[PDB]
Each structure stands twice: as structure tokens, then as C-alpha cells.
């Protein structure tokens with residue numbers, strides 16, 4: 191259940207993934223259901239997550255309503271994000287719904303709009319990754335973001351509301367590849383205890 195290097199699998203019904211580039215270290219402990227704990231030290235980039243991976247055949251509307259109820263003890267020492275994260279394919283898009291961060295509020299771009307949902311206000315952004323790692327190899331792809339205006343580390347994220355806002359703004363989405371509660375670190379160290387993480391699709395928890 192101890193993951194300290196790149197790994198993808200399923201643990202207690204949740205698709206887990208540990209992903210890092212070279213340098214530093216990370217430790218992910220897979221706990222019950224969608225839960226896990228994470229610790230990182232002097233990394234370049236590291237991501238820890240537990241959610242659902244899909245077979246790339248359905249739009250988010252076809253999957254249905256996606257909602258995540260979570261709670262995490264988030265203790266970054268520097269740059270890190272606590273978020274819902276995933277990808278679409280055709281087009282290849284990496285996305286983030288950021289509820290908390292460390293010393294820097296991402297993603298450093300001019301907002302494209304705002305969404306009010308789940309008792310918060312999020313700024314919406316679109317950024318570009320050029321020849322970077324991806325679920326489909328070294329690629330150039332967009333990153334879509336919703337970033338909360340104030341931090342929080344527990345609550346419910348109505349994922350599908352964010353997708354509709356993005357599509358409303360012309361941020362095109364492809365077929366679902368993944369949706370997951372994620373901890374990301376960048377050129378930093380820290381820890382996070384994800385003690386609560388339930389993904390519901392059409393009101394039904396993952397299993």
C-alpha cells in the first residue's frame with residue numbers, strides 16, 4: 191500500500207497515482223477508500239491522487255454529475271496545491287479546481303472569468319504547457335483552472351459545475367480520462383493527510 195515512486199493502480203476502489211519527475215522524494219500511503227497520506231521533500235514536481243480514471247469514451251455530461259466531498263490536513267512548506275485534478279482527451283486538457291495552496295496562489299495568469307459555487311468564489315484561468323509530461327507523452331496542452339479566492343481544506347466540490355463554467359467560457363473539454371482529489375507540490379517540501387475523499391457520480395459513491 192506504500193508508494194514512493196511512479197505508480198498507477200486501484201486501491202480500495204479508487205484509481206490511485208503517484209507521479210514525480212526526477213529529484214527529491216515522496217511517500218504516499220494508501221489508506222481506506224479515497225484516503226491517503228502524502229509527504230514530499232525537495233522535489234521538482236510531484237502529484238499524489240485518488241479518484242477515478244475513465245476509458246476515454248464519454249464527455250463529462252455522459253459520465254454524469256461528479257461531486258467530491260473531502261477533508262485534508264494540508265501542510266505545505268512552499269509551493270503546493272490541494273485540488274480536484276484530472277484530464278480530458280481529444281482535446282488533451284489537464285485541469286485543476288484549487289481549494290488551497292501554499293505560499294503562491296496559482297496559476298499566475300489573467301483571469302478569464304469567475305464561478306460562484308460551493309459557498310466560494312473561484313477565478314477561472316487557462317494556461318499552456320509546451321512539450322511537458324502528460325498522460326499521453328511529451329505534449330503541448332492547455333491547463334484549465336478554477337482557483338478559490340480564499341483557502342479551505344474541507345468541503346464539497348461540485349466538479350461538473352466547474353466544467354459547465356469552463357465550457358461556457360469556450361474552454362473546450364474532451365472525453366473524460368480522470369477526476370481526482372489531488373495534492374501537488376512544486377520545488378518544495380511538505381505533507382498532507384487526506385482523511386476524507388468520496389467521489390460521487392450521479393450521487394453514488396465510488397466502490
Ligand SMILES: *[C@H]1OC[C@@H](O[C@@H]2OC[C@@H](O)[C@H](O)[C@H]2O)[C@H](O)[C@H]1F
Pocket residue numbers: 207209235237284319322323324325326333
Ligand atoms: C500537470 O501535472 C503534472 C503533469 O502531469 C503528469 O504528466 C505525466 C502523467 O504520467 C501523470 O499522470 C500526470 O499527472 C503535467 O505536465 C502538468 F501539466
